[PDB]
Structure formats: C-alpha cells, structure tokens
Amino acid sequence: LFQAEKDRRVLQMLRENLEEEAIIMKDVPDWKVGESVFHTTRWVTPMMGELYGLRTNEEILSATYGFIWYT
Amino acid sequence: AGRIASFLKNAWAKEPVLVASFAIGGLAIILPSLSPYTNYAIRINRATPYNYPVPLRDDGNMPDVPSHPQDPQGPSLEWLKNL
Amino acid sequence: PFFDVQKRLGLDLDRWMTIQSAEQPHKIPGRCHAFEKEWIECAHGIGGIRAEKECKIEFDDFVECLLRQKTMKRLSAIKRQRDKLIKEGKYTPPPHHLGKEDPRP
Amino acid sequence: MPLVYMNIIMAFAIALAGLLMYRSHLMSSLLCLEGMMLSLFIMSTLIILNTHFTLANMMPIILLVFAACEAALGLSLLVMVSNTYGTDYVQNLNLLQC
Amino acid sequence: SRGEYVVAKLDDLVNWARRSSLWPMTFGLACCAVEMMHMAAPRYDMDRFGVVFRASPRQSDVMIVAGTLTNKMAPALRKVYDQMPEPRYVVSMGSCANGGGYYHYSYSVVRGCDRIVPVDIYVPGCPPTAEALLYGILQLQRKIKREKRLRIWYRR
Amino acid sequence: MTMYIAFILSTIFVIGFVGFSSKPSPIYGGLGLIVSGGVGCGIVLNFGGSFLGLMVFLIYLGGMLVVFGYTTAMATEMYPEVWVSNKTVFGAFVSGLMMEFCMVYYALKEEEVEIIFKFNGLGDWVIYDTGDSGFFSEEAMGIAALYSYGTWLVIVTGWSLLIGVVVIMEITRGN
Amino acid sequence: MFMINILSLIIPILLAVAFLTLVERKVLGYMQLRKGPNVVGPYGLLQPIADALKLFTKEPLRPATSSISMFIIAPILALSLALTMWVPLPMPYPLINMNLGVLFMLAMSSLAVYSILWSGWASNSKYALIGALRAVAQTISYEVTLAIILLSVLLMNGSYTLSTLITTQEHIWMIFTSWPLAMMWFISTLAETNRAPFDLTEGESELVSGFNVEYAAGPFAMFFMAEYANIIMMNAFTAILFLGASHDPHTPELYTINFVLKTLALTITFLWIRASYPRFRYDQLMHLLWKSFLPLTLALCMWHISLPIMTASIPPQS
Amino acid sequence: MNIMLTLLTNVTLASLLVLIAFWLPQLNAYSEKTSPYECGFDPMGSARLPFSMKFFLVAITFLLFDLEIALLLPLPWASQTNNLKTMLTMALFLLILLAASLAYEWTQKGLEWAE
Amino acid sequence: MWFEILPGIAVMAACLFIPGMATAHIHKFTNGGKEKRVAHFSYQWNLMERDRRISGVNRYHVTKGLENID
Ligand SMILES: CCCCCCCCCCCCCCCCC[C@@H](O)O[C@H](CO[C@H](O)CCCCCCCCCCCCCCC)COP(=O)(O)OCC[N+](C)(C)C
Ligand SMILES: CCCCCCCCCCCCCCCCC[C@@H](O)O[C@H](CO[C@H](O)CCCCCCCCCCCCCCC)COP(=O)(O)OCC[N+](C)(C)C
Ligand SMILES: CCCCCCCCCCCCCCCCC[C@@H](O)O[C@H](CO[C@H](O)CCCCCCCCCCCCCCC)COP(=O)(O)OCC[N+](C)(C)C
Ligand SMILES: CCCCCCCC/C=C\CCCCCCCC(=O)O[C@H](COC(=O)CCCCCCC/C=C/CCCCCCCC)COP(=O)(O)OCCN
Ligand SMILES: CCCCCCCC/C=C\CCCCCCCC(=O)O[C@H](COC(=O)CCCCCCC/C=C/CCCCCCCC)COP(=O)(O)OCCN
Ligand SMILES: CCCCCCCCCCC1=C(C)C(=O)C(OC)=C(OC)C1=O
Ligand code: SF4
Asked: Which 3-state string (H, E, C) describes E19-68?
C-alpha cells in the first residue's frame, strides 16, 4: 500500500511540475516541455530537486533534512 | 606433565591476571566450534526478513512455492518458537 | 605489472568491491545501478578502445546519473525564467506550489 | 558539483600547499599531512554517501587506519631527529647534499 | 530611600556570602600551625563553619600567619599574599607573627608580620589554642559582617 | 538555498585548514585541526554519515592529544607563535582567507571552472535521492560488511598494524 | 517548548552539582569522625549558595605570562561539554534521541580533556604544565580499555542506542552477565573523571593545584562545576549501563526514581572511595591499565563476541 | 536542529557566566598579583622550555591502538550477518593480532618509561 | 549524627528528579499525550510523514481511525 501511494504521489508531483513548466517556459524559443536529459527511455527515479524545485523552502527542508535532524 | 604443572603454578602465583586472560581467550577461540547452537544462530540470522519478499511469476511448475503465506509450502519457523 | 593471481586461482580478493552494481549486503542497490549495469553490459568483451566510442551513450547516461549536471542546469533555467516572469508580475505560482496544497498519502 | 565538494577540494589544496612550504618546525608539516588525510576522508565519505555505494562505506575507515600508521611513523622519526639536535627544525637535516 | 535600602540589603547578602565561605591558604610556618592543624581536627572541625584550606593562593581568601616570619622568608610571604585575589584578609596567629615573640631581638626575624602585610585580626598566645584560633576566625567573620562597601559607594 | 548550513560548515572547514596550514606553533595548529575535524564530522552527519563522522572526530581527538604532548616535549620555543605574532604566518593566513573568498565569489556569482570543472552551487539538497525504505542504516550495514565481505582488507589492515608497532619499536631504539 | 526542556535539564543539574559538594563535605566529615558543614543554614543547606556567591563576587586575575584567549576558552569548553553530555541520557526518555549515543558520549568525553590541556598550557606556569602532561598520560592510560569495555558490554545490547539498554535489562541487570567488565569499567570512570585515587591532574599534595593553579573565582568555579557534573553524569551512565531499572510506559516516574537512586548510590560510592584510599603514581596508573586491564579486556571482548554465537543469543536491530 | 540549539544554549550559558565573573567584581590588577606562581619565588626558567616525555613510545603505540577501536566498533552490526563463521574468525583474528602487538611491546621493554 | 547527611542528599535527589520527569511531561504535552514517536530508521519517519499528511492539521499525532473511511 505504501508503494502504491508513493508511486501516485511522485507521479502527481511530476505532473504538477510539468504543467507549471509548460506555463512558465512558453516564451523560450527552442525549449521542449518535458524533455529528458537521458538518451534512455526507461524510467528514472526522480531526484529531490526535480520533485521539490518549484516549492517552498520549508517543504524542501522537511524533504531533505527532516529525517536526519529528527531526534 | 610436571613441567607444565610447575609452570602453571608459578604463573598462577605471579601473574593470575595473565593466566585468566589466556584461559578466557582460549575458551573463546575453541568453544564456538563445538557448540550445536551456532547453526541455530545462523538460522536465526537468516530468518529475519529485512527486505520485502518479491513474489515469483507462476508458470505451473513450482510445487514447492506457496500461493499464500498460510499455505503449507515454504520455510517454517516452528522450530524458533520452542527455541 | 599486473599478475592476475585472482583470475588464475579464482579467489576474488578485491573484485567484490570494484563496482557499485555487484552484490551489496541486504540487496541494497546503488543510486545508479541500472545505468552502470547497462554500460558494463554494453562494453563487455570488446576492449577499451571500442568501448570508448561504441558505448558512449551508456557512459554519458551513467555520468549524468552520477553527477546530475544537465538536470541541475535545466532546473536552474526553469527557476531563472520563473523568477524573471514573477518580477514583472506576468506569472503567479499555483496554490499547491506555495504551501496551500491538499496533501495525499 | 555542489559547493561543498569545491570547499573540500580547496581544503586539500591548502593542506598540500602548507606541507610543501616549510617553516622551521617539522611538527607543523606532520599536522599538514594529517589535515590532508582528514580532507581525503571527508571527500571520499561524501562521494560514497551520495552515490549510495554501500560496500564502499568501509573504505574511509581503512583510510583512517593507514593514516594512523603514517602519523605514528612521522612521530617516530621526529623523536630521533630531536634526540640528535635537541630541536625539530628542518634546517638541521642538511648533512646530505645533491 | 529605596536605593539606600537596596544597597544595604545587597551589602548584607555579599557580606554573608563572604563570611560564610572563608578559604584560608594552606600556609604555616612553625609550632602555631600544629595548633591550626588541631582546629581542622574532628573536635573543632573548622570545615563545619565553611572554612576550607586551599593550596593555591588564587583560590584562597585568608592568610593565617601561623609561625615565625624570618627575613629569608618575608619576600615569599609578601609574594603569596600579593597573589591572593581580592577581597583578602590576614590573620596573625601567635606571638612570633604578632610581634616577634621569643625571637623578637634576633638578627634574622621580622618583628611582626604587620611590617610586611596589613593584618585584620591578632590572635595572642604561644601558641594560641585551637579554640582561641576559632574565636579569632569567628571575630573576623563578625568584622566582615560589619562591612558596608555598597552603602559607601551609594553615598559617594 | 535552504539555510546553506552545509556550505557554512564547509567554509569553517576551509578556515580551519588555513589556520593550521599557515603553521603557527603546533598548539594552535592542533587546535585548528580539532576544529576542522569537528566541523567535518558535522558535515558528514548532515549527509547521513553518523558513524563515520563520529569516528573521525574521535580518532583525530586522540591523535591531537598525542600531538599536543609531543609538541610540549620537542616542538616548543620561548615565545610560541600565534597567527598575529608573525608577518609570515599572518600573511599566509590572510592569503588563504582571501583565496577562499575569491573562489567562493567566482563560484556562486558565475559558472567558472577553477581547476577541475565548474558548477553553480544551488546547495547540496538538490542532489539527494529520496529513498524511502528500510529498518536499518545503509552506512552501518556497509561498514559491518567488512567482517563478511572484506576479509582481505581485515587481513592486510591487521598485518599493517602489527608491523607498525614493530616498526616504531625498531625506529626509536637508537644506539 | 524544546528550550523549556533544555533549561529544565541544565538548571537542575547545576543545582544538583552545587548540593553534591555539600554532600561530599558532610560524607567526608562523618567518615573522618567529624560533621562537615552544619552552620550555614540548617544542616549546611545554604553552604553551596554561599560558596557560589563568594566565588562569583571575587576578583578574577589574568596571569601576565598567560595566553588570554585559550585561558578564557578552556573553562567555557569544560562547562559547555559537561552540560552537553547529559542530552542523550534516557530518564527514561532522552532529550535528544540518537542512534549512536554511546559513540557521541565517547567523542564528547575525548573532547573534554582539551579543556584541562589548554588551561594548563595557557596558564604558562610550571605546575599547570605538569598537570596538563599528567592529563595527557591519564588519557593515554585509560582510553582504549574504556572503549573496548563499552564495545564488549554493548555486544549484548545489539546497538549503540542508550534507550535500548532499558529493553536489554528488562528481566535481569547486565552486571549479572558482565560483572568482571563492570569492575574494570568502574575503575575506568574513576580515571576518566580524574577522581581519587587517580586525581593526578590536580594533585594537591604534589602540584599545589595542578592545571587550575592559576585560576581564581568564576573560571575556577566553572571548572569545579564541570568536574562534579561529569562525576554525576558518569555515575548515571553506569547505572543505565549495568543496573537496568524496570520501565513502565504509563508510569515513567517509577523509572526516574529508580534511576536517580541508583545514580546517587554510585556517586556516594565515589565519595567513599575518595575517603578510603591513597593516591596512585601516574606511571603506576598507566602500568595498571596497560598490563592488567588491557589483557583481561581483550580476552573478555573475545569471549563476549563468541558467547552470543555459541548460545544463539544475538540481540535484534542490526 | 535540536542538537545545534542545545550546543548554542550551553556555550552561551558558559560564556555568560565568564562575562559575569569578569565584569561584576572589583578588579585591582598590579604586577605582583599577576606574576607567575612558584610557591614563594620567581621561576628560574621559562615554562615554555622543552618538557621531556618519558612515555613517548607508549604515546605512539596509543595512536595505533586507537584505530583498533574504529575497526572493532561495527561488531554489533557485523554479528547480524548470515556467515557468522567468517565474521567470528575475522574478529577473533583482529583481536589476536592486537594482543600479539601488546605482547611484543611488553616483552621488548616497550612499556617501561625512559629513565 | 549521620542522618544529618540525609537532607542535602534529598535535595540533590529532588533536583535529579526534575529533568527526566519534565522530559516525559513535555513529550506528552507536544505529542497528544501519547509518548513522542521514535524514528531511528527511515521507515518510521515515512510513517510519521504519512501520518502528518493525512492528519488534516499538519500534525502527525492526530490519529485518524476507522471513522475516516466513511
Ligand atoms: C536566582 C539566581 C541569581 C541570584 C543568585 C543568589 C541567590 C540569593 C542567595 C540566597 C540568600 C540566602 C542567604 C541568607 C542567610 C542568612 C542566615 C542568618 O544567619 O543571617 C543572619 C542575618 O542575615 C544577614 O544579616 C543578611 C543575609 C540575608 C541577605 C539579604 C537578602 C537579599 C536577597 C536579594 C537577592 C537578589 C540576588 C541578585 C538579583 C539580581 C545573621 O546570622 P549570622 O551572624 O550569619 O550567624 C551566626 C552563627 N550562629 C547562628 C551560629 C550564632
Ligand atoms: C599461496 C600460499 C598460501 C599461504 C600464504 C598466503 C599469504 C597471504 C595471507 C593469506 C592469504 C589470503 C587468502 C584469504 C582470502 C579471503 C577470502 C576467502 O578466503 O573467502 C573467505 C573465507 O573465510 C576464511 O575463513 C578466510 C579466513 C582465513 C584467514 C585468517 C588467518 C590467515 C592469515 C595468515 C596471514 C596474515 C598475516 C599473518 C597472521 C599471523 C570469505 O568467504 P565467505 O565468507 O565464505 O563468502 C564471502 C562472499 N559473500 C559475502 C557473498 C557471502
Ligand atoms: C545567570 C545567567 C543570566 C545572567 C543575565 C545578566 C548578564 C550580565 C552580563 C554582565 C553584567 C554584570 C556586570 C555588572 C554591571 C555592568 C557594569 C559594566 O559592565 O559596565 C560599566 C559601564 O561603563 C561604561 O564604560 C560607561 C557607560 C557608557 C557606555 C554605554 C553605551 C550606551 C549608553 C548611552 C546612554 C543612553 C542610554 C542608551 C541605552 C538605552 C563599566 O563599569 P567598569 O568600572 O568599567 O567595571 C567594573 C564594574 N563594577 C564597578 C561593577 C565592579
Ligand atoms: C590462546 C589464547 C590467546 C588469545 C587470548 C589472549 C588475550 C589477551 C592476553 C594477552 C595480552 C598480552 C600478554 C603479554 C604477555 C607478556 C608477558 C611478560 O613478559 O610479563 C612478565 C610477567 O609475566 C611472566 O612472568 C611471563 C609469562 C608468565 C605466564 C603468563 C601466562 C602464560 C600462559 C598461562 C595460562 C595458560 C592457559 C590457562 C589454563 C588454565 C589452567 C588449567 C613481566 O612482567 P613485568 O610487568 O615486566 O614485571 C614487573 C614486576 N616484576
Ligand atoms: C566460564 C567463563 C567465564 C568467563 C571468566 C570470568 C571469570 C573472571 C575472573 C577474573 C575477574 C577479575 C576482574 C577484575 C579485573 C582487574 C583485577 C586486577 O587484578 O587488577 C589489579 C589491581 O586492581 C585494583 O586494585 C584497582 C585499583 C583501584 C581501586 C579504586 C577503588 C576500588 C573499587 C571498590 C569497589 C569496586 C566496585 C566495582 C563495581 C561497581 C559496580 C559498577 C591488578 O593490580 P596489582 O594488584 O597491583 O598487580 C599488578 C601486577 N600483577
Ligand atoms: C587538611 C588537614 C590539615 C592540614 C593543615 C595545613 C596546615 C599547613 C601548614 C604547613 C605545615 C605543614 C603542612 C606541616 O606538615 C608542618 O609540620 C612540620 C608544619 O609545621 C608546623 C607546617 O607549617
Ligand atoms: S608564637 Fe610560640 S608556638 Fe607560635 S610559632 Fe612562635 S614560638 Fe611557636
């Protein structure tokens, strides 16, 4: 159940980032929305910055240092 | 026989700490090879499920793989409960 | 120079530690396990000279996984454009990107 | 690369420069050697932690072990040097020329 | 006046603290020190008053001059007195420290430690009994209790 | 961007390295190395290396106690030097400080390749992994694997330690 | 609300430390056929307050030959470390819950010695230098044996988490399984806190005052506070390590009372030992630790590694 | 985050105590009060002169013995491996070599202080 | 006493009672009264984060039972 929820949450975050990027970067002439940086077409586990790039600093802090700093 | 007896007596009279240390170290080296519970310790270590058991794709030729955890097939920790 | 005693005797003195995709304890995977696996299987048995050219795509993907330079560049470009559009007031971030989202498990 | 990687590499460069430029005391150069080892430990630990290379987690510890040996080695030599001269100044080690 | 009352109460507090915790230096010269050792003995138990010997002059409050002070020793006594941080007190114990005593007319004896350091209490005797020394320390406690440093500062 | 705690820690690391590399009296060099060890422990703790950081701090504390004793024995002078008691020491300290300042400025203000490569900074938090599983610590497992995977490493390390004891005894014999 | 918890941890420890001095003076007195402080307040209950007020209203002095920065830094380091080392202790809950609390405590202990070392060196006096070198020798004497004893004892716990020590000793005290090591551990604590018969860094009868001879008033009081706090803290650690109190999740005050009583018993045992014995020579301490404690410690480490495998009694939580 | 706050609080309290101790009382500093202490007299030499270490060899050996602690600390986690025989063999071998080092230095008079 | 040593000891004991007890009470006050959660491993932290996300008030200790499955 945790696995299914994690997949849904990650995919939702990535889709939200995709839509925001599509809205934001409409003016740049040679930019493809959602273009990958890998030649391979297989699934790549998202990096922290990709998931939390366009969010608040508090969410980023909780995502990065939340577990380590919890005591 | 007698030479070792005299040497051990002199050591026990002069250096009891060293005698005890060597005895404890020798016992620690020797005893594990003669114990029947070392195998039990290994099996207890193997029986701890740290990661998820990934199921196998059924192909109709595995009589010894359960289709449900409560099925009789597979390993059993009945020995562990009484241990 | 390199007397391969390990290969002659079949000992594995230090080959268990040479690569990231090789039998970690508890089956804990490396961050770039798939990319390294792809590159190693591409380059196996063809020699270094041919592997440098014919397996350059796999190695580039592996290095991108390792260091994430291109991903950081893309994220920086997106954030720079977002800041530029926000300073002139043409763009507004959505509520879920401002801390007022509806969380899900 | 993160800015932390650059800071650690700069720390190694500073320690190497401090070792290569000698003042009088040999103990200072030994301390520069120890600092170089510490920076190497930090750099390797950060790389191995970031890449999640599990079996490499024992690599830094081994480094420390041999660092100790090197440290001990240096101190041993220092003692003898002092015993000859009453001082650890490197300018007394000039009996041999090129 | 509120300020006068405040400074009086603060004077009371600091005087109580300083007289309830008196740490003399571990310092004795002659027979008198033996009687001093009998004041720390169980019968009198000077520690029960809060009086504890401390070897370091930096950590001590009181100089008890228990014994004859010679000319060869006077610079050392003055040095370890000067190295006592303030506030500091000196108790002269016995005839030799008070005025020279039995060796007053000698060529090598200082005729009283008050030629070298200021003295707060003079304890007579040759030697004073441990009880007489205890009386001297209690009198010094009373004298410290009579101090009005903060009131004097306020009235300046 | 998030509070740049790791950047501040690494900057203090570099400052301590400059402190002991300008080579004042070995007392202050040892102090600087102790500070650098503690701060590097903090960095590794922030990246998830609890055991490794704590161990490096402990090891360097013991080594620096030995170094302090040896400095008082055979590395002293009438007037031990501080970072401001010497033109050479102060010059080296200042040069290291401004060199770190220049490197940092050329790093976070623009993308330039100093020696090896270039980058933008952006704080370490970006390059993490968001791995979500486990009832253990991967660092502890990898370190504990030394007794099951690294038999060869244990053998060579123990041999080197015994040989090092023999070696120091041979060296300090004199005669 | 976490700052409230920090204050509720640190202030009572200082208050406890102040009263500890009064108890030692009285315990020493009654063991020496006298009374100890019984005049300043009822039963001398106001004596620590008077001592503190006297010490903090006295003039501190900077030695002319001293190195001012290190001279000031050393007492701050000592007191701050003494306060810090209490945060992972489970009573039965810790202020800071660490996976590796024992290793953190070891590292902070190792760092605490540098307060003594730097105070002795920066005092720029001969007796202070002798005291600092004695501290170096003491650390070299006890460190490795202490660490190996900790490892051997914790092999039965399964991890370095302090709170797990409560679960390990749920039915029996760990001492009943490791009473030999415990004795050695006790002695190591006496050497770790510079307590008699191993009070060599100060060494009043030999070095006047040792490392802190040049310190007066407030910094000296801070050194004293740090030392007594370390005494109480190490006895609390020993009580947690070897005498496991039974913990009720719904009644943690029972555990707190049990733990405090055991800690007070161990501290009073320290005071008793100070009252009973002469002082070691600081070379004899190193010979004792390296020629008697180390071989037994190594043999017992070997035995305690082999024992859980032999009996199939390996604890959980890899 | 909490540990940083605790460390800051402890250091701040100690520093504030030092500040109180140095700024509250009345100070009267003169050259005789601040002179070095040698129990009655001026020291003959400097305290910065070399001070011989008679236990230098034991001090060096402490460096090598301090890393055996690093090697032996992961033993509780190593005890959870499946191949307990190899782990036990390696741990016992490491401790045996440590004991052999101690014995070698002991028999070669390496634990005796210099005269 | 010799029992005159007891009062000071008692004071010390009272002081040593304060920290742990306080911690317990504080741990109950800021965690819904139910023994602050321990997260030594990332699985426990993930459980806590999921609890906070599904609490509806950004507080992990607000527990949702079977009344939340309508
Ligand atoms: C909170 C942290 C900051 C402050 C730190 C200090 C805390 C305050 C100190 C505690 C005060 C208690 C001391 C009072 C004890 C007096 C007991 C009695 O004996 O005193 C008598 C009278 O009292 C004294 O005259 C005055 C002492 C009372 C002090 C005045 C109260 C001021 C309190 C203000 C506190 C403010 C602190 C700083 C705030 C910023 C004189 O009797 P004495 O001659 O000795 O004994 C003779 C011996 N016999 C009995 C055997 C025959
Ligand atoms: C050719 C001449 C031979 C004699 C001289 C050789 C000189 C070199 C010294 C010894 C040679 C090293 C060979 C041992 C390599 C270790 C690997 C191999 O032996 O397997 C180990 C078998 O274990 C053995 O017990 C190794 C221990 C034997 C060595 C201990 C004592 C010998 C040391 C002698 C020289 C050292 C210095 C001097 C000491 C006095 C572990 O394998 P295992 O655990 O199954 O599975 C691991 C894979 N997993 C993780 C996926 C499960
Ligand atoms: C227990 C932990 C909690 C403690 C909390 C309190 C922390 C206290 C920290 C230290 C304070 C205790 C010291 C006692 C009072 C301070 C007096 C000193 O620090 O300042 C004096 C102030 O002197 C200054 O040099 C002159 C004052 C002018 C400078 C002030 C700058 C701004 C004032 C401008 C006037 C307009 C008002 C602006 C503010 C609103 C200097 O006196 P000085 O003689 O050297 O030193 C000896 C002090 N004696 C006499 C008490 C022994
Ligand atoms: C097979 C076990 C191996 C592993 C276990 C060992 C664990 C650790 C123990 C070894 C640690 C190092 C030991 C170092 C030995 C050095 C011996 C030595 O030279 O010391 C002699 C002292 O000892 C000797 O006399 C030489 C050896 C004496 C015998 C010691 C024990 C030998 C073996 C006896 C035990 C056998 C096993 C027990 C059997 C039980 C009986 C049925 C000199 O003493 P000083 O301090 O210099 O004297 C100064 C004051 N006069
Ligand atoms: C079947 C397998 C079982 C495993 C084996 C178990 C049996 C173990 C048998 C031996 C156990 C001995 C444990 C003690 C370890 C050290 C003992 C020792 O011999 O040390 C002494 C010295 O030890 C001391 O005297 C200690 C001095 C410090 C005294 C300080 C106070 C004493 C403490 C009093 C109460 C102790 C309470 C400890 C436990 C408290 C609870 C935690 C050696 O020194 P010397 O006599 O001078 O001779 C050296 C040259 N041959
Ligand atoms: C702490 C137990 C009581 C100790 C009292 C310390 C007294 C210090 C005086 C110095 C002294 C000592 C030590 C001393 O032992 C002695 O006898 C020869 C003297 O001559 C009478 C002395 O003056
Ligand atoms: S006064 Fe009498 S008892 Fe005291 S020191 Fe002089 S001669 Fe001795």
From this structure: HHCECEECCCCCHHHHHHHHHCCCCCCHHHHCECCECCHHHCCEEEEECC
